[PDB]
Amino acid sequence: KVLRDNIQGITKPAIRRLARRGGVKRISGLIYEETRGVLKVFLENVIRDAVTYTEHAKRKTVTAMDVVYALKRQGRTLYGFGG
Amino acid sequence: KRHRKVLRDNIQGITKPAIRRLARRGGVKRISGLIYEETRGVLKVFLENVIRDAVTYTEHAKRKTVTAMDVVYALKRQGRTLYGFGG
Amino acid sequence: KRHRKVLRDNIQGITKPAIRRLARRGGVKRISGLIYEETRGVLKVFLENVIRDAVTYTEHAKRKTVTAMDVVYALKRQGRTLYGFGG
Amino acid sequence: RYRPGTVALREIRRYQKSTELLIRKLPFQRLVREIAQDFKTDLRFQSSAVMALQEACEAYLVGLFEDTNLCAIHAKRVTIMPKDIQLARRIRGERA
Amino acid sequence: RYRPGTVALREIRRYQKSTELLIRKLPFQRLVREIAQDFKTDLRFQSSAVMALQEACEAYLVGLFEDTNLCAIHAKRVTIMPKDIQLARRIRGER
Amino acid sequence: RSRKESYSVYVYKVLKQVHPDTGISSKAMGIMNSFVNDIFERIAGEASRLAHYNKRSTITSREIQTAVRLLLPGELAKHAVSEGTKAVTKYTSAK
Amino acid sequence: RSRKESYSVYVYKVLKQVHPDTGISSKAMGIMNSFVNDIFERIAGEASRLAHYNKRSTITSREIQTAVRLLLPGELAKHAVSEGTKAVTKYTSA
Amino acid sequence: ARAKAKTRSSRAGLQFPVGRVHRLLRKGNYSERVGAGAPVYLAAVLEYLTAEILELAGNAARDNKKTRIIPRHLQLAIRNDEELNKLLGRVTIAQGGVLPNIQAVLLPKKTESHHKAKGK
Amino acid sequence: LAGNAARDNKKTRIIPRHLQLAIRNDEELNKLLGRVTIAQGGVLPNIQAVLLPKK
DNA sequence: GGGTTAGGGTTAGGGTTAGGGTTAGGGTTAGGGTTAGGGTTAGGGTTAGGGTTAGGGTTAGGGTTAGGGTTAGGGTTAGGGTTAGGGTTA
DNA sequence: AACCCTAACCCTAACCCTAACCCTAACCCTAACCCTAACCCTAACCCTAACCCTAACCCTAACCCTAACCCTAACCCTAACCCTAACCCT
C-alpha cells in the first residue's frame, strides 16, 4: 500500500513504443488516462479472482498457478509459467 | 416422370425488403446493396458450422433425426446457451 | 419415392483397377503411397472448365441437349482437337 | 412533399414492441436440409430444432446488425458499409 | 535531413523483432500489492506470479492497441481517438 | 412411465411467496428449467476443480460459499453468501 | 520431495524422430507441458458429457474418435482419426 | 419413537429441495465424496436467485398491465439490471426481443438554414 | 440556443418559453442568470422519482 | 413429426419520380517530426540479514455409510380474473 | 395507463401414492501446530552510457466550404405465397 503515485505508473514516451509493437503509429492525449483506467479495472478483476482463489485454498501467497487458473477461467489460457 | 431432389435457389431465400425490417429491430435505418449477399454468405457459413456440429452429435448418438436438444447442446458448445426449446 | 443414393457419384469409380490401368499405358511402372486422391481431383477441373463451355453454347441457341457438335468447339478453345467422335 | 424521418422510427418502434417471427419456416428448413445433405445423406429435421435454429440465427443477425450500425454511426455516417460487417467480425474474432 | 515517416517504421520493426520487456518490475509489484491491500491486508507476492501478470497485461495492452489502431485506420484517420478504446471495449464485450 | 425431472412446484411456491396472485406461463417454465440446470453445472463444476487443485476431494459448505464470489458479481454474491450462512446456521442449530 | 509429472522424455523422443540433431529449450519445455495438460482436460472432458447425454458411462475408442472432429478442425481431425484407427488396429491385431 | 409429525425439510421458507441436488451431484461424476452442508448452500443460493429473478420480472410485467410472466417480461427484466445482465450476458432468451432504445445522431440537417431567399 | 430549443417544437419563432427552456438548460448560462426570472417562461418538467408510482 | 384437400386474405412483388446524400476539386491554416544539445535515471557488480517458504508425527473434530419412517412432493382437474381483438371516445 | 368484452390460461383446491428428505447409530479420515533450516523478497549504493527531455523550421494532413448527379427513399393493382383448422397415419 503506497501513496497514489503508483497509479500513474504509465508514462507517455514509454507507452509510445509499447503500442508500436502492435502497429500503432500515432496516438493522442487522453489515451494515457483511458488505457490506465482500463488496465486498472482489468487488474482489479484479476486480483479479485486471485484473492478468491487463494481464499479457497486458505493461502496468503498469490502464486503463478492461481493466476494462470484465473486467467483461464476468464478466457485467457496463458502458457509458460505454471502447469 | 417421378423423382427430383433439391436445387440451389433456396440459398437466395433472403429477399431485400424483408431484410430491411429485420435490421430495423436492432436499430439500423439505412443499409446498402452488397449486404444482401454478404449477410447471406455469413449466414450460410454459420449454418454450415451449426449443421456440421449437429450432424456430429447425432452421429455420436447414432440417430438420424436432428432434435432440438442436440441443437441446443451444439449452440452451448459454440458459446450460445439458447433457452426455451429443450432442457 | 426416390433412391437414397443421391450422391450422384462423389468422384469415385476410378480407383485401383482404373488409375493403374491408365498409368500403365503411358509408361508408369510402380505407384507410391499417395499418387491417387489428387488424381481424381485434377480431372474435376478438366470437366469444370469444358462442360461449362458446352452449356453456355447450348444456352445461346435456346437448346437443352449438348450434342457431339458442341463438344468439339469447347475443346478447340483450350487446344485439344479430337477427330472421329465429333465430325 | 413532407420530409421523411418519422416512418422509419415508427416501424422500428412497432417491430421492437412486438415479438413476431420475420423469417419463414419452410425455406429455412429446406436450406438447413440442403446444408445437412452436403455432409451426410438421409437426414431429417424436427420442428423445435429448426425453431431454435431460427431463433439463434435471428439473435445473431440482430447482434451483428446492431454492432455494424454502432460502428458506422461513430464515423459521422448514418448508413453502414459492406466493409463494416467484416470489420465487426474481425474485431469480435469470428473470421480472424 | 531525413523526412519523418521512416524512424517510426524502423522502431516498430526493431521492437517487433525483439522479445524484451518494456514495463518495469518493482513499480508493477508495488501497484499489484496496493491493489491487493484494498481487499485484504498482510499479503505477499512472488516472482513468477508477477511475471505472468506482467506478461498477461502486456498481451492485453498489445491486443487493445492493435484493435484501436485497426478501428481508427478504417475511418480515414492515421491516428486514434480516446473514444476508440471505449468503442473497442464495447464491441468486444468488456464493459 | 419414466417421468422427467423438472423444477415446477418449487418455482411456483417461490413465485407465490415473492408475489401473490401470480403464476408462470408455458414457455417460461421451460426457460426457468433450462436456466436452473445451466447454473447447476456451473457452480458445482467449479467446486470439483477447486478441490482437485488443492489435492483434496471434499466439497463442503466452504467450497460452495467460495464459488459464489467467483460466479456471482458483487452485491448478489454477498447476499447469496449471507443467505447460505444463515441457512447452514439454522440447519446446524436444529436437525 | 514428491516428484512432479512432466512430459519430457516422450517430447524429446518425438522431436528427435521428426527432426534429427534438434532439441528443446528451457521455457519451451514448460510451454509444451502446459499445452499438453490443457488439451488433456478438453478432449477427455467432452467425452464424459457426451456419454452422460446419452444415459451412458462408457468412454471407449468411439467416444474419443468422435471428440476429434469436435475439437480439431478439418484436415487435422481426419488425420488424427486415421492415426487413431491405425493405432487401435495395430493394438487389436497383436 | 414416532411421536408427532415433525414438519421440517422446507424450513425457514426454503422451498427448494434440499436433497435432489445431493443425488444429482453424486451420480453426476463431480467428486468422489459429497458433504452435507453443500446441498443446503446450493439450494439456498438457487432459491435466492430464482426469487430475485421472479420479483424483478413481476414488477416489469405489472407495468404493461399483465399479471402473467411472459418471456418478453423476463427478457426486459434480465437486460435491465446491471448484475443480472453481467451474469447472463451470453444467454439469449427465445421469443424475447431487443430493449426499446433508439439512437442519437440520426438527422443530418439539424439547423435547417435558409439556403434560398425571402424574396422570390 | 433559443433557435435550437424552438426548432424542436416545429416553430421557427423564438418565444419567451423557448428562451426560458434554453437558458435553464446550459450549464454556463445557468450560473450567470441564476437570479433572473424570465416572465412568461414557466419552469422545467422535473418530477421526483419518489412521487412516481414505483414498485 | 409428415401429408393430405379447400381458401382466402394478409403479405410479397411488378412501375415511378423527386429530393437530399456521397462523391469530386482548391488552398487552408492549424498540427506532428527531427536533428543539434545536455542531464539525467535505469542497466549492470557486492553483500547479508531478516522475512518468509518448505517437510513431518498426531490427534479429535471434521467427515462417510447401511438401515428404516415420512413430511414433503409430483401428474390431473375445475371455473374465474384478467389477457388478446373490435367498435367507441378521446 | 380506454380497460372491455371476450373469454382460456392462468387459475385456487385436492389428492395418492410417493419418492426423495430426515433419523440413528456406528465409525474414520481429514485440518493445525510446533522444531527446523534453507534460499528467495527485500534493503543502501556507483557508475556511465544509451535513453530521455526541450526548443526551432517546415511540409504534408484533416476540415470547411463550393456545385453536382444518381441511388433510395414514399403510394399503386395485384395475386402469388403464407396461414388456419381437422384428421390420418405410419
From Swiss-Prot, chain A:
Changing residue 16 to W: In TEBIVANED3; results in early developmental defects when expressed in zebrafish embryos. The modification N6-propionyllysine is found at residues 12, 25, 58, 60, 72. There is a cross-link at residues 1, 12, 40, 60, 72 (Glycyl lysine isopeptide (Lys-Gly) (interchain with G-Cter in SUMO2)). The modification N6-(2-hydroxyisobutyryl)lysine is found at residues 12, 25, 40, 58, 60, 72. GO terms for biological process: chromatin organization; negative regulation of megakaryocyte differentiation; nucleosome assembly; protein localization to CENP-A containing chromatin; telomere organization. Changing residue 18 to P: In TEBIVANED3; results in early developmental defects when expressed in zebrafish embryos. The modification N6-(beta-hydroxybutyryl)lysine is found at residues 12, 58, 72. GO terms for molecular function: DNA binding; protein heterodimerization activity; RNA binding; structural constituent of chromatin. The modification Phosphoserine is found at residue 28. The modification N6,N6-dimethyllysine is found at residue 1. One of its GO terms (cellular component) is nucleus. It is linked to Tessadori-Bicknell-Van Haaften neurodevelopmental syndrome 1: An autosomal dominant disorder with onset in infancy, characterized by poor overall growth, microcephaly, hypotonia, profound global developmental delay, impaired intellectual development, poor or absent speech, and characteristic dysmorphic facial features, including hypertelorism and abnormal nose. Other variable neurologic and systemic features may also occur. This is Histone H4. It comes from Homo sapiens. The gene is H4C1. The chain holds residues 21 to 103 of 103 of the full protein.
Curated annotation (Swiss-Prot), chain D:
Transmembrane segments: none annotated. Acetylation is generally linked to gene activation. Acetylation at Lys-83 (H3K122ac) by EP300/p300 plays a central role in chromatin structure: localizes at the surface of the histone octamer and stimulates transcription, possibly by promoting nucleosome instability. The modification N6-succinyllysine is found at residues 17, 40, 83. The modification N6-lactoyllysine is found at residues 17, 40. The modification Phosphothreonine is found at residues 41, 68. The modification Phosphoserine is found at residues 18, 47. One of its GO terms (cellular component) is nucleoplasm. It is found in: Nucleus; Chromosome. It is linked to Glioma: Gliomas are benign or malignant central nervous system neoplasms derived from glial cells. They comprise astrocytomas and glioblastoma multiforme that are derived from astrocytes, oligodendrogliomas derived from oligodendrocytes and ependymomas derived from ependymocytes. Belongs to the histone H3 family. This is Histone H3.1. It comes from Homo sapiens. The lineage of its organism: Eukaryota, Metazoa, Chordata, Craniata, Vertebrata.
Swiss-Prot record, chain F:
GO terms for cellular component: cytosol; extracellular space; nucleoplasm; nucleosome; nucleus. The modification Dimethylated arginine is found at residue 49. The modification PolyADP-ribosyl glutamic acid is found at residue 5. The modification Omega-N-methylarginine is found at residues 56, 62. One of its GO terms (molecular function) is DNA binding. The modification N6-malonyllysine is found at residue 86. This is Histone H2B type 1-K. It comes from Homo sapiens (Human).
UniProtKB/Swiss-Prot annotation, chain I:
GO terms for molecular function: DNA binding; protein heterodimerization activity; structural constituent of chromatin. The modification N6-(beta-hydroxybutyryl)lysine is found at residues 31, 54. One of its GO terms (cellular component) is extracellular exosome. The modification N6-(2-hydroxyisobutyryl)lysine is found at residues 10-11, 31, 54. The modification N5-methylglutamine is found at residue 40. The nucleosome is a histone octamer containing two molecules each of H2A, H2B, H3 and H4 assembled in one H3-H4 heterotetramer and two H2A-H2B heterodimers. The octamer wraps approximately 147 bp of DNA. This is Histone H2A type 1-B/E. It comes from Homo sapiens. The gene is H2AC4. The chain holds residues 66 to 120 of 130 of the full protein.
